[PDB]
């Protein structure tokens, strides 16, 4: 795992994208590179001890949909350091940074069944009061909850599932 | 002619980058124009990227990274035989007394 | 354009169009040489302690079966 190596590159890419008003394009560009990083043949090439320069050129070629500023520079700098396998994380970090500056939170909700869209809108407005961000709910239908909902807002979690209450009662006994 | 470049200098050891189709063997000699003098490197390792670790047969000061180095395709060779009797020689087989060149027929 | 399916087919096709080739199993390439140890890239079906045949009639013993490299003596 290489969160720690991806942090500098993500921060540099984002801090550059706001100097040139193209965060939205950079995100899709990094997502394209992160997908090319996963291929079975390309992952065999990245493991191979080619010279950083020719390995970078062998990586530029498979992605022409890329700015001069973005691909031909970021990919080369990451190749000189041998960091290209970090791209899937440089993406996620980038997204996160964006969500930070845009004052947004990707709250996740989990339930045994669909919510009434009044429950869910109340959840949105209430989390937006609990936090200080525009929330973006996404639901999951997990049956083991059976009733109630889990609201996860990053490291904070609120558990109202009947299974959670049952197992807590199990440990009050 | 010169085909490689210095990419590191750590004291006595030097790293040199070559095209991957021309990387020297593991005891060949290399030559660098250090300022105005000529410095000989002996390669000790082949690292992966057309790079090569060498030991400098001389003073390492003054070396920039990015200098061109020239690939002598033979190991260090010294004069030998009768010709080398009454004389003092360098590690590179060069004469170090103030007399003329060595008259060897074989190295 | 931006559809992930289209991108995944486009990348498989573009990588093949470049004419990269994977290593065969049972084969590899030397990538480092120093002090009697060599590092071989590929060679996925090497076994620990297996005799590896080098150019010439020389052999090496595969001792380190790491990921991304084999270390042999």
> Domain map of chain C by residue range?
1-73
Chain B residues in contact with A52 (beta carbon < 8 A):
49
Q: How far is CA B40 from the centre of its chain?
A: 2
Chain A residues in contact with C68 (beta carbon < 8 A):
47
Supply A155's token pair.
């490291």
Give the fold, CATH level 3, of A3-101: Peroxidase; domain 1 (1.10.520)
Residue pairs between chains B and C whose CB atoms are closer than 8 Å: 15
Cβ neighbours of residue A137 closer than 8 Å, sequence gap 6 or more: A107, A108, A109, A120, A123, A124, A127
Supply A140's token pair.
């999951």
Q: Are the beta carbons of B33 and B1 closer than 8 angstroms? A: no
- The enclosing domain of B52 has a CATH number of 2.40.10.170
Chain A residues in contact with C4 (beta carbon < 8 A):
35
Look at phi and psi of residue B102 and say left if phi exceeds 0, alpha if psi is from -120 to 50, else beta: beta
Q: Are the beta carbons of B39 and B94 closer than 8 angstroms? A: no
The answer to whether C34 contacts B44, with C-beta atoms less than 8 Å apart, is yes
Helices C4-18 and A40-47: crossing angle in degrees, nearest 10, is: 50
Strand partners, C28: C42
Is the minimum CB–CB distance between A169 and chain B shorter than 8 Å?
Answer: no
Query: Which candidate in C1, C3, C18, C34 is best for mutational testing of the A interface (most A CBs within 10 A)?
Result: C18
Which DSSP letter does residue B63 get? P
Is the minimum CB–CB distance between A48 and chain B shorter than 8 Å?
Answer: no
The rounded distance, in Å, linking the Cα atoms of B16 and B7 is 6
The answer to whether C31 contacts B45, with C-beta atoms less than 8 Å apart, is no
Q: How many CB atoms lie within 10 A of CB A115?
A: 15
Q: Looking at domain C1-73, does it have CATH number 1.10.10.10?
A: no
The residue of chain A nearest to residue B51, with distances taken between CA atoms, is: A51
The A-side interface with C (CB below 8 A) comprises 28, 32, 35-36, 39, 41-42, 44-45, 47-49, 58, 61-62
Chain C residues in contact with B48 (beta carbon < 8 A):
31-32, 39
Report long-range pairs for C20-29 (Cβ below 8 Å, ≥24 apart): C20/A41, C20/A42, C20/A45, C20/A58, C22/A41, C22/A44, C23/A44, C28/C70
The residue of chain C nearest to residue A32, with distances taken between CA atoms, is: C7
3-state secondary structure of A109: strand
Is the minimum CB–CB distance between A36 and chain B shorter than 8 Å?
Answer: no
Experiment type: cryo-EM
């Amino acid at each position: 795992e290489f969160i720690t190596v991806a942090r500098p590159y993500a921060k540099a890419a984002f801090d550059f994208a706001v100097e040139h008003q193209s965060v939205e394009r950079w995100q899709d560009m990094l997502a394209f590179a992160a997908e090319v990083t996963k291929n079975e043949q390309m992952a065999e090439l990245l493991s191979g001890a080619l010279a950083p320069e020719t390995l970078a050129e062998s990586f530029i070629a498979v992605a022409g949909e890329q700015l001069d500023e973005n691909g031909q520079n970021l990919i080369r700098v990451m190749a000189e350091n041998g960091r290209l396998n970090a791209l899937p994380d440089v993406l996620e970090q980038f997204i996160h940074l964006r969500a930070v500056s845009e004052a947004t939170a990707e709250v996740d909700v989990i339930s045994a069944a669909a919510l009434s869209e009044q429950q869910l809108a109340k959840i949105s407005a209430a989390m937006e009061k609990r936090l200080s961000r525009k929330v973006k709910l996404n639901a999951k239908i997990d049956k083991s909850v059976m009733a109630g909902v889990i609201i996860r807002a990053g490291d904070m979690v609120i558990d109202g599932s009947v299974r959670g209450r049952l197992e807590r009662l199990a440990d009050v006994l | 002619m010169a085909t490689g470049k210095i990419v590191q200098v750590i004291g006595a050891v030097v790293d040199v980058e070559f095209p991957q189709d021309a990387v020297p063997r593991v005891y060949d000699a290399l030559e660098v124009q250090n300022g105005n003098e000529r410095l000989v490197l002996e390669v000790q390792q082949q690292l992966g990227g057309g790079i090569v670790r060498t030991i400098a047969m001389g003073s390492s000061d003054g070396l920039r990274r990015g200098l061109d180095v020239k690939d002598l395709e033979h190991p260090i060779e010294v004069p030998v035989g009768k010709a080398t009797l009454g004389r003092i020689m360098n590690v590179l087989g060069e004469p170090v007394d103030m007399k003329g060149e060595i008259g060897e027929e074989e190295r | 354009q931006l559809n992930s399916t289209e991108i995944s087919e486009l990348i498989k096709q573009r990588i093949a169009q470049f004419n990269v080739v994977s290593e065969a199993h049972n084969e590899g390439t030397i990538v480092s040489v120093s002090d009697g140890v060599i590092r071989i890239h590929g060679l996925a079906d090497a076994m620990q302690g297996e005799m590896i045949s080098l150019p010439g009639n020389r052999y090496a013993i595969a001792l380190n079966l790491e990921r991304d490299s084999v270390g042999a003596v």
